[PDB]
Ligand binder design. Structure first.
Ligand code: CMP
Ligand code: CMP
Ligand code: AU
Lengths: 206, 200
């Protein structure tokens, strides 16, 4: 299961982050690995023009701040992205040093980190393909269907219910909020979606 | 640390342009590039390819299916040049890589570097349409070693299929974009040779 990380979680300070609080700022030094006990985070980078873009989300059981543990040519790395609390989050903080020791005495901790990193690489590579091959309408639709199969998605009698804004969809797909607003109203009249303010229901997805 | 991994690996060679990994296949084999270089490609449903990135000597590939317990190959791996690769079953690697953490940290370092590069590719792709992507692909190719100086700028040799694989669109879309880019005065197409103007 995940028992092998209990030796790790016993050596963790636990912090709380309210919604929208920034946990990691892109560009900083990397000395701390995080582990989500409760809540969820948003991974944001900045685009060619400096605009925010949402890459994805991490949830319970996920490590973050781990890419800085691995040094290209053996020297300091900086935080590759911003990690912001999406809802209220209880996270466990562990030093890179204590991790190296614990991943020294038990290699299944690296194996778990590797599984999570591999899945992130698969998802981000598909995101590359979505941006290159799909126009905005197809990207909004693929985002709704994708969020329906990720955690924090809700079973609805007519399908699934996800908690998300059109501003957030626009930052995910790479367009303005007013055009994602148009696409969402068109997809609604076509029977794919319902917008509910702070929640959207995607039909035919259960 | 070093020869101990390759000592339990079969040695195989792939000539240039040969497909080593087919996307969608079961993942049961881990690879290691001893010599050469490969291209990582994905496809859409219509069969259009896009180059995700490149791997070289000392890199593992075919590793993403290794951490499952039931996974299929995430992309096509094509030999860019001739490659000697070391192939090991996921099973024998898992056996040998139980306590040996100095190799798992190596795989994680290479995966972390791939994640940083691909995330940067995501940020680059967003908000640009195909015309903007073809245009920056041409300016990028103008600074490569196989490019040639032109009195009016830079001169590159590349096909519309190769541009289409860089930007992730069809060769016929690249042709339309190129005709518009000439109408903007940025490029001039001469069959298999293209001139990009005002590049510096
Ligand atoms: N493409 C991505 N997908 C998921 N998480 C990411 C991605 N890029 C960066 N991160 C996370 O964001 C963190 C920023 O700091 P680190 O580089 O230490 O570790 C990083 C990862 O936890
Ligand atoms: N974004 C990427 N960057 C570099 N290599 C990749 C990327 N995505 C997939 N790969 C490689 O392509 C392989 C395809 O099969 P695997 O998923 O087993 O392992 C994969 C990696 O070795
Ligand atoms: Au747009």
């Amino acid at each position: 299961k995940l028992k092998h990380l209990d030796k790790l979680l016993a050596h963790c300070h636990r912090r709380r982050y309210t919604a929208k609080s920034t946990i990691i700022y892109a560009g900083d030094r990397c000395e701390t690995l995080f582990f989500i006990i409760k809540g969820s985070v948003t991974i944001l980078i900045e685009d060619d023009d400096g605009r925010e873009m949402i890459i994805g989300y991490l949830n319970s059981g996920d490590f973050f701040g781990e890419l800085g543990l691995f040094e290209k040519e053996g020297s300091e790395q900086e935080r590759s992205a911003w990690v912001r609390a999406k809802v209220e989050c209880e996270v466990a903080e562990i030093s890179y040093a204590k991790f190296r020791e614990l991943s020294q005495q038990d290699s299944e901790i690296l194996y778990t980190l590797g599984s999570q990193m591999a899945d992130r690489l698969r998802k981000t590579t598909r995101k590359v393909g979505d941006l290159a091959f799909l126009d905005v309408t197809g990207r909004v639709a693929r985002t709704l269907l994708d969020l329906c199969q990720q955690p924090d998605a809700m079973t609805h009698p007519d399908g699934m219910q996800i908690k998300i804004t059109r501003q957030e969809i626009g930052r995910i797909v790479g367009c303005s909020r007013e055009m994602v607003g148009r696409v969402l109203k068109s997809l609604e009249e076509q029977g794919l979606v319902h917008v509910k303010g702070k929640t959207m229901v995607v039909f035919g997805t259960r």
